[PDB]
């Protein structure tokens with residue numbers, strides 16, 4: 001009834017919603033993502049089972065007004081009680097809720113990425129009523145928008161395509177959500193969203209544009225917490241190692257791997273190099289092991305725990321030089337016969 | 352109804368399920384384990400309370416279409432909304448589910464692996480307005496989809512998790528366009544035929560050589576502990 | 588604290604009802620630095636009480652008549668403008684409240700150390716140096732162009748800062764940092780006024796490699 | 811009902827159960843322990859309070875079929891649910907099971923010496 005209370009005027013408000021109410025930059029990504037979120041909300045109202053695994057995340061200052069803007073859009077159906085993603089109670093809390101706010105991403109701290117994906121991407125809520133006799137099977141009519149104050153809130157890098165961060169700034173806000181997001185204005189926003197959705201009512205219409213998706217990937221990486229080990233591993237792997245390197249003891253292996261030459265002095269020919277008998281003296285690395293990284297690159301002597309090599313293996317896989325399958329080979333006196341990668345520096349030395 | 356909606360003509364689709372759709376290897380282990388998985392699914396449908404503790408696990412990139420292929424196989428009765436595996440209410444989440452998929456985005460904790468072992472190991476569920484209504488069937492068959500290459504930690508979990516390595520650019524058929532309800536129905540009819548040739552749980556087990564080289568695969572997908580080699584070098 | 592509605596189902600209830608929050612919160616503390624947030628604490632309003640400066644005693648003088656009179660006065664003031672905006676503090680009160688909240692909050696001592704480290708001029712060839720050379724040159728104490736008792740342009744202002752550069756050069760630590768160390772260094776860098784807020788990938792050196800870092804602008808410092 | 815469903819013919823297959831099905835050596839210790847284990851199983855299903863502190867641990871390769879032999883022995887009453895000896899959850903998973911299997915002795919890794927000895 002609210003959506004159809006008034007016909008849309010034609011003012012095109014939803015695209016610049018967070019742009020001029022919260023100060024988000026006037027990118028194509030922001031416009032597309034806010035438009036798609038509004039259409040997704042209207043779709044979940046009109047098609048209660050429609051698929052939608054996206055969610056907006058609003059980053060900004062303490063006083064910018066993110067929660068107030070979400071509350072105005074939610075109105076009576078706004079939800080502020082999703083503090084966890086586990087248990088059967090939250091699905092009951094999503095009954096009369098349409099716009100749901102993961103305030104401060106509090107649930108994120110408690111939950112795991114799999115739980116977040118399962119909660120966001122669900123379609124139905126299977127639970128019996130308090131006094132009913134039969135399970136009710138309510139479709140999921142709620143759409144999720146989270147607000148945060150921490151810049152680097154996406155700690156994981158495996159599943160992050162769902163979250164679309166938006167960077168707000170109070171100084172950039174032309175309007176104010178406190179007195180300008182009147183119920184008539186949100187009604188006119190949702191009317192426009194309904195018009196756009198009706199232009200093509202399908203679950204694929206809620207996906208982002210190709211250019212919008214291309215910026216979305218970059219923004220998700222910019223808001224994702226990075227691993228600084230992979231850069232160090234890559235720099236260590238890019239060092240030419242002398243020929244007959246695996247036949248040296250560990251003590252001289254460390255000094256050979258820690259004699260660093262500038263990349264201008266390589267004087268390469270694709271594979272051969274004269275670092276200034278010289279052409280064959282040094283050669284690119286052919287293999288690397290997690291234990292070799294532990295003992296040679298980090299100059300460690302204590303026996304490493306399992307999680308250290310788990311982290312080193314993750315870093316080596318994230319490295320663009322190493323593959324993904326591990327082969328068993330002898331590495332040296334301190335490393336022994338180990339499962340290691342086959343580093344191929346083809347991406348490197350193409351300079 | 353769907354499995355018996357149409358009989359099975361001779362096409363031999365059961366063996367090359369994940370090979371030509373997810374770019375797996377044309378290996379005897381892959382064919383045998385995919386065939387046994389489909390037979391286990393149709394057996395759990397037909398002989399509801401059966402002993403089938405195996406679990407296909409698919410490894411691949413972020414977009415090889417393993418979850419899409421699993422959803423295409425499951426249809427309406429595909430399930431992914433299972434994230435915790437210990438407790439009592441979990442058995443309620445299995446009511447309308449046939450193919451349950453466990454997706455591992457980030458690395459599972461050591462407890463979660465034991466939880467999924469003890470979950471897929473069950474063959475019966477108990478729920479409830481009288482007579483305790485023991486939901487004996489347990490028609491569910493489980494498939495996991497993992498992002499990390501090395502997902503096996505314990506030696507206990509081996510011999511029950513059957514990993515399959517899925518690659519891209521080598522898949523003959525696209526899972527987004529070629530897994531249609533007709534083809535999956537024909538595959539399940541073929542599985543019905545093969546399982547009905549020997550309706551027993553012993554028929555769901557792998558071939559002897561298939562199992563012995565499944566041991567090799569499970570070793571190739573497990574953590575290495577990296578210390579036996581150093582001790583060997585010290586001893587040498 | 589900021590929540591306005593609680594959605595939940597009562598003990599003997601039919602549905603998960605929405606309950607507007609009719610309660611107002613006050614806290615009493617004995618610790619001084621009780622605010623543990625460094626980003627901001629606008630909602631909290633620390634009031635520093637002190638006995639021997641109390642002209643009246645809450646144990647004897649706060650009779651229910653007195654509190655009823657206080658709440659009647661509050662109702663009068665609110666009814667002068669029955670709006671949420673009326674509840675907001677005065678423009679001067681807000682400016683003083685910002686200072687009070689930062690006074691009663693916990694401080695990140697790493698931020699000052701980071702800022703001091705970034706203020707040291709570095710040799711023009713700083714990035715084309717060994718890690719030990721970087722530790723030697725950066726750790727010395729040192730008229731946009733500088734003359735630290737040398738030729739002009741031998742020392743310039745820093746333009747890139749990495750968390751691993753902080754970990755390896757400023758702290759001079761050869762230990763491999765846990766992710767919680769680099770998270771703290773990243774927060775310290777973001778709270779720095781010289782440092783920006785968006786990280787861009789660039790290669791730093793032999794021990795650091797190609798890693799995401801900030802472009803640092805010392806315009807505030809040398810001016 | 812199953813135990814006395816059919817009388818016992820004098821075949822003498824109790825003392826060599828693990829000997830000729832799992833390949834254990836033909837020691838006197840092996841025969842005695844497996845015979846006493848089966849006698850204790852029958853006792854505990856007949857005299858529920860009987861005191862039987864023993865439990866047989868089958869050590870062997872990963873293909874000898876220890877779990878298979880144990881499951882065949884147990885029948886519909888075989889249990890592999892137990893994973894730890896801490897709390898009342900183990901007692902609640904130990905009620906409807908005649909034979910309980912400590913898979914890979916995982917519980918032994920997750921519990922103290924005193925806890926496993928008491929349980």
Ligand SMILES: Nc1ncnc2c1ncn2[C@@H]1O[C@H](COP(=O)(O)OP(=O)(O)OP(O)(O)=S)[C@@H](O)[C@H]1O
Nearest residue numbers: 061062063064065066067068147149178671672675
């Ligand atoms: N009626 C109002 N008129 C103007 N400003 C208001 C009003 N109500 C609250 N504010 C101010 O708006 C800011 C709080 O708005 P919120 O929606 O809580 O912002 P937020 O950025 O979501 O906050 P957090 O703390 O990050 S959840 C504070 O500066 C308040 O003083």
Ligand SMILES: Nc1ncnc2c1ncn2[C@@H]1O[C@H](COP(=O)(O)OP(=O)(O)OP(O)(O)=S)[C@@H](O)[C@H]1O
Nearest residue numbers: 411412413414415416417418419420454496498527
């Ligand atoms: N026509 C298409 N339809 C659907 N997805 C497509 C299509 N073309 C490419 N894709 C991509 O294929 C992937 C589909 O994979 P999913 O089934 O959603 O999850 P997945 O393949 O299992 O990967 P993970 O590691 O589990 S998230 C997504 O990354 C899509 O962007």
Ligand SMILES: Nc1ncnc2c1ncn2[C@@H]1O[C@H](COP(=O)(O)OP(=O)(O)OP(O)(O)=S)[C@@H](O)[C@H]1O
Nearest residue numbers: 509510556559562563871872873874875876877878
């Ligand atoms: N028909 C068969 N004949 C012989 N061996 C078989 C046959 N079917 C399966 N196996 C093997 O028997 C083993 C089955 O494992 P289980 O039943 O748990 O017994 P197990 O050998 O103790 O294994 P674990 O890991 O120690 S519990 C696997 O090694 C299979 O390869």
Ligand SMILES: [Mg+2]
Nearest residue numbers: 066067147589
């Ligand atoms: Mg807020």
